[PDB]
Design a protein around this ligand. Structure first.
Ligand code: CL
Lengths: 97, 108
């Protein structure tokens, strides 16, 4: 019961960070491996200003990590809890089915 | 070799993903709430009534009814009555799998 409240708060904080169509798209792409910002901006329909904000949100939530290789910025999953949620709501569509 | 249907089968479709992402986005929006999440966990064990939910959770004497109504308007819970007994159940199988994933092990 008191353990439920602790689990409920951590879970809801995780779902809050994932309850966004654009962010969910980024997670899915990153489920198939590390990808750069231009790769995601190329794949994602919306404007690149929205992509970088969604990336910044996923990063400050600890749900993705980044690294720089010169002028390139690469992003990867960095959270096993979020990967399982993404895997569940997509029904392994990002795994390649 | 080189068929359209074949190279399409092997290529992940970004717009089918967009369709799934929006539906999953709406599902997580309905669940990204601590109070509603706790209701979902209790209902994952089985059918439970409103007053035994208010008994078990007790966020406040009126917040359970508010969160139950919102879970119902989103299609995640179901309602039925036997006189003085309102029986609520987990109606959406997609939400059940999300609850099972985040509550790895806790409800059922
Ligand atoms: Cl937006």
């Amino acid at each position: 019961a008191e353990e439920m409240a602790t689990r409920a708060r951590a879970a809801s904080n995780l779902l809050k960070a994932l309850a966004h169509e654009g962010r969910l798209m980024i997670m899915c792409y990153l489920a198939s491996g590390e990808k750069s910002v231009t790769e995601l901006e190329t794949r994602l329909s919306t404007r690149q200003a929205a992509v970088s904000q969604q990336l910044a949100r996923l990063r400050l939530e600890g749900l993705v990590q980044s690294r720089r290789e010169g002028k390139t910025i690469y992003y990867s999953l960095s959270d096993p809890r979020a990967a399982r949620v993404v895997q569940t709501v997509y029904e392994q569509f990002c795994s390649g089915d």
